[PDB]
């Protein structure tokens, strides 16, 4: 599970969509169908667009490239909205780690 | 978005002096001064700056 930082910049989002590992709505519409396998968008044009999800693909360096939808059936999506998350993205933004509760102190030499 | 220094028709590694690897004043806004490899490829592999763009 990916988790965007509490403390970020405005660069996570705009880097995640350009990186291209997220799925992005080419045209505005309504979600007709949504599985873990694909997402269909009925544009107001009357046409349909469908985006098959990369499911548990092997990246060049052995990390899991697993897309996951973040829309629901019936949702109104605009052009360029993010439909589905990628490997290190959370709701369209780059999520490279987790927010961890930290104490800054020495502890019995185990953080020596 | 990388900007590599080595290659055919470029410079070779035995010719990689210390000065091609320095942050040049002209890099401002074009090649990021922070992102570069720690090891041997330092100053040889740099990445394009945010708002930068290449002309024809």
């Amino acid at each position: 599970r990916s988790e965007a930082p509490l403390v970020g910049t405005g660069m996570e989002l705009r880097a995640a969509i350009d990186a291209g590992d997220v799925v992005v709505a080419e045209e505005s519409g309504v979600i007709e169908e949504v599985s873990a396998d694909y997402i269909t968008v009925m544009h107001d044009n009357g046409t349909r667009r469908t985006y098959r999800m990369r499911k548990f693909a092997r990246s060049n360096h052995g990390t899991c490239a697993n897309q996951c939808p973040i829309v629901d059936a019936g949702d109104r999506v605009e052009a360029g909205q993010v439909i589905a998350d990628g490997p290190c993205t959370d709701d369209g933004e780059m999520a490279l780690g987790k927010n961890l509760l930290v104490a800054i102190m020495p502890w019995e030499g185990h953080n020596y | 978005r990388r900007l590599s220094a080595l290659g055919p028709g470029g410079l070779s590694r035995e010719r990689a002096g210390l000065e091609v690897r320095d942050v040049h004043p002209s890099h401002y806004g074009r090649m990021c001064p922070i992102e570069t490899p720690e090891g041997p490829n330092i100053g040889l592999i740099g990445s394009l700056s945010v708002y930068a763009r290449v002309n024809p």
């Binding site: 509490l6 403390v7 548990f56 800054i104 953080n111 | -």
Partner: protein, 336 residues
Amino acid sequence: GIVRIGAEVRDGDILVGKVTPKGETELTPEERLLRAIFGEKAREVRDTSLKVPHGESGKVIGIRVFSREDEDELPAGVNELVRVYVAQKRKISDGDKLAGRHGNKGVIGKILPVEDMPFLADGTPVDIILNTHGVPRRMNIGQILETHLGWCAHSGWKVDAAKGVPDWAARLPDELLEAQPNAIVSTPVFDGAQEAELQGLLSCTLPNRDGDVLVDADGKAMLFDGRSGEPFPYPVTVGYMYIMKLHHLVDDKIHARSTGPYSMITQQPLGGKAQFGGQRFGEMECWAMQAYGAAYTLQELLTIKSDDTVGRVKVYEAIVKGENIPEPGIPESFKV
């Protein structure tokens, strides 16, 4: 002969059975007795099957096979081509590498029980303990500033706007005078949250469910040692820090070898964990051994653990039979 989809595999498990025709002269005396006794009469082969490499394991999640009997583009001479995809769920472990965004890297020394971890006044144990000695020396005080803001965004805040707008909050956008717990915020580089604005938010931190302010206006808190129960005598900075999992993980890097393949020219052990290689006891390491004056350790490393093709075998032979280790022969690389 291909492993079945969904299997759980471990070191040395067959994934694809394969046999390579060896000549008759390559049958061992035993393999030649059983073949004659039971009259196998099938052409003699060597077990050249694809196994699971040392130190890895997982679920077979995908099989992909290409045949020459089917019309399939293969390289010349290649009849059948099959890929097995193995997936492992990797829990964070001792030796895995973590870092924040400020160049503050470290590997994991110990994963303690939740009860042993220093915990806040409400029982919440901390997740990660970063040593104080590492921060100031390395000039990445950004991690401390982040920790402070990380706590502010986790707890949420409500800036006192009653009498007006305090001087520190003057330059703050209206959408930042209050924030719900676990709020999401930006610190743009060179245009981020200034020191005064940050120190203000540490005052108006919303409390937890019991009305308690766990982190004071300095960013420090009182923690209990979960081993003794006694409190730690001074307030510790606690807060929320973004910590990434870097791709330098023990599972990839642990490697060991008693005996394995050897390069054909030199007869020395191959290199690389992937090839089940041996570690390189190099020039500066021989100087070290020499400087100690460890003559026999230096000889043994350089003859029977590497290059003496007969002494190798004689040594494994000796250990298995509980005898003394024999005398070194001549390194094959000197012959070369």
